[PDB]
Structures are given as C-alpha cells and as structure tokens.
C-alpha cells in the first residue's frame, strides 16, 4: 500500500534473458521483510496488471574489499521476479 516494498529494478544477463521470449519476467529488489502477497499488492497499486506468479530470492551478505585497509560487508537484498502474462510488456521507466 505505502509502496516502500518495491525498492529497485536490476538489469543483468539473466534479467534480459527472461525479459525476452513471449512471457516477460521483470526482476526488482524489494523490502527484505515483505512477503509475496505484499509484492503483488504493490505491483497492483502502481502498475495495474495482476502478476501471474512471484518468486523471491534472498542473497546473504558477504565480505567485500578483503585485504583493503578497512574491510566491509555486503547489503542484504531480496529479489522478486514478476512475470506479466503473454503479449503484455510495460515499461519500467515512463509513467
């Protein structure tokens, strides 16, 4: 509802592999405390087309810049894979 649980889309080889070929799959990063139903509700209130299904990924934080004077950890990401129905393709930018 408040729509702070849809943080950010990401574009990689996997993302572009899915975002082509009939069914499109759009991968965003979401609030790690949000649930699948919340993801569907947010997409409803901000896009307007019911997702066919939602998949979630949790990537654990890991050490980065090892050996550098100040080492640091990563940031916790939750990934969401929206799939719009056949033949529909909306733009992530431009509303």
């Amino acid at each position: 509802d408040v729509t702070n649980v849809l943080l950010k889309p990401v574009l990689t080889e996997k993302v572009y592999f899915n975002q082509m070929g009939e069914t499109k799959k759009y991968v965003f990063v979401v609030n790690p405390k949000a649930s699948k139903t919340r993801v569907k509700l947010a997409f409803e209130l901000v896009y307007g087309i019911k997702p066919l299904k939602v998949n979630t990924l949790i990537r654990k934080p890991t050490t980065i810049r090892g050996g550098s004077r100040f080492p640091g950890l990563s940031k916790l990401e939750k990934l969401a894979v929206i799939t719009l129905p056949k033949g529909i393709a909306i733009s992530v930018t431009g509303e």
Binding site: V10, L11, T12, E13, Y16
Partner: peptide, 30 residues
C-alpha cells in the same frame, strides 16, 4: 555501422562484452 563501433568494449555495469544490447547502449554511458 555506428552501433557496431559503440558495442566494442565499453562494458556496462551489469553486463559483459560481446552480448551488448543491440538497442540499449546510450543510457548509462551517454
């Protein structure tokens, strides 16, 4: 022609070389 020349190296953040998008090479590195 121009798009072949602009696909060489110039690796985008989340991608590698070779499979540079045939249409999307003008947004980040504009």
């Amino acid at each position: 022609k121009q798009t072949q020349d602009l696909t060489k190296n110039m690796k985008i953040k989340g991608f590698r070389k070779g499979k540079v998008p045939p249409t999307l090479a003008k947004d980040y590195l504009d």
